[model samples]
Target chain A: ETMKFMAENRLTLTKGTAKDIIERFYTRHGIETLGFDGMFVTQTLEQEDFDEVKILTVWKSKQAFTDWLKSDVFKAAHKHVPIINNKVITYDIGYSYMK
Target chain B: TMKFMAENRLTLTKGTAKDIIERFYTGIETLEGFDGMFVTQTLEQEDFDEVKILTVWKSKQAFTDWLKVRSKNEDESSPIINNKVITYDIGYSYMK
Candidate 1:
């Protein structure tokens, strides 16, 4: 069966600044945009000067995620965003179990 | 802080990874501190499939406890090629 897609954005930002920025981002630009299923943010376990946050976004399909990257919503959400090092990795849902 | 353990698994056989993970449905929920698990297939390649198993726990100790008594397998013809486990702390989350 074809499954849902996911895109994880790994960000390396200044220490103690991740939580604020992430919350503000969600508040200012809600994730209710096209094809968006859900999102979560995670910080790495390592203790370091630079904080690592993984912003994971679930999508209906791979193409849907790609389309959002090129849409006006993308530009609006990312316009004038603060500088932060990041990389994106994509995935598809093979199976999911929740409690 | 809440913990998230991601196990990246690579397999050559289609659907094999998901099949293996689905087997966990039997008892993982019974464990303490267990939250949720997602079997994600990485999209980095066309030759092979990489299934990333993401498990959420209330703490690292909760995950470690499960690992100590996890199921054992004795299959000689398994399809899994590799696995890498990474742990992280949940900083923030939103649902709709």
Candidate 2:
């Protein structure tokens, strides 16, 4: 029964800007804050009018995620971005597996 | 470790998110290149609930195969207002 905390940043990016943003993360894990366990960069499977990039960040604990929000890394990474809209949602791992 | 991942993000009407998870069932583990799956529900929401069904694949082609098979038998009905399927290439991950 392993439970991890996850934060989903559902970002609606300005059209044609997702590629650069995705590339930035691929070259540099911009979210490597304390307790940051893992990160995933997901782009909508179907290209739509506006691009949606769902950034999922997993932390070792809820407290770690909370701490990250207050850290400079959070502010710096978000400072200059082409995000049209963003909504943050948190979750507790309900079930998980690996093979 | 996974090379590819697919996430099904669902926006459900308030009060019905948990129900979907309770009824969740899948037989994908038997498929080749299957790595893992995780079902997660939002901690809190103002008007609606969000759930994520994440599946990791050993390769992107494995995910493509999954979509091919599942696409043919498309059938569903629930409190979900919207469903978005997203795919990702593992960028970076760390452990401590």
Candidate 3:
């Protein structure tokens, strides 16, 4: 019943670029190094006014995420990110489900 | 182009895990403010560790607000759990 809520961060880079960087990061560093178990990165296929790609991730705890943010590893791996635009939104997960 | 998304990790104790989760699902099913949430787990042989739970909301603000309101009423009967939950938020751009 004790869950940690960390700030959610979003970075917008070219589709190919985002995928490349994320794949490399996961393969080379793995999620655990960043205190997360895994991540879900996807692109929207909707015919809406705005077209965007999204990446979502879940971590073990807030401390785990914080540790990664504070680590040099994140800086090194994320430094060359080809982000065109971005925004960070943080939230707490009061209730969640999986199937 | 930009992409925005959020994932929430939850750790439950065994004592009230069922009740708390029930509340969570109930919210997902009947909450007018929420659209829909998709859930998935990491495969055992998938070259990665830890279970993954992913969800999508109508908007960031809506999701954020939902957490603020529902987190308070989480159950506390079966309070023992051994799993760690994690979430990830991503953004994207297209190449043409």
Best by DockQ: 1
For model 2, how does the per-residue alpha-carbon lDDT over B1-96 read when each residue is reduced to its tens digit?
576788888888788776676555357888888887878888978898877888988788998988891221244545787777877765434433
lDDT of 1: 0.68
**What fraction of the correct interface contacts does each predicted structure contain?**
0.80, 0.69, 0.12
Each prediction's DockQ against the real complex: 0.56, 0.50, 0.09
Where does model 3 exceed 4 Å of error? A1-7, A13-28, A47-51, A80-82, B1-24, B27-96
- Per-structure clash totals for the candidates: 0, 0, 32
RMSD of each: 4.7, 4.4, 13.2
Model 2, residue A67: distance off in Å is 0.7
Top model number, lDDT: 2
Name the lDDT value of residue B50 in candidate 2: 78
Error of 3 at A19 (Å): 5.2
In candidate 3, position B1 carries an lDDT of: 14
Clashing pairs in 1: none
Model 1: how far residue A72 lies from native, Å:
3.5
Residue B18 CA displacement from its true place in model 3, Å: 20
Off by over 4 Å in 2: A1-3, A27-33, B1-3, B11-13, B23-27, B30-32, B67-96
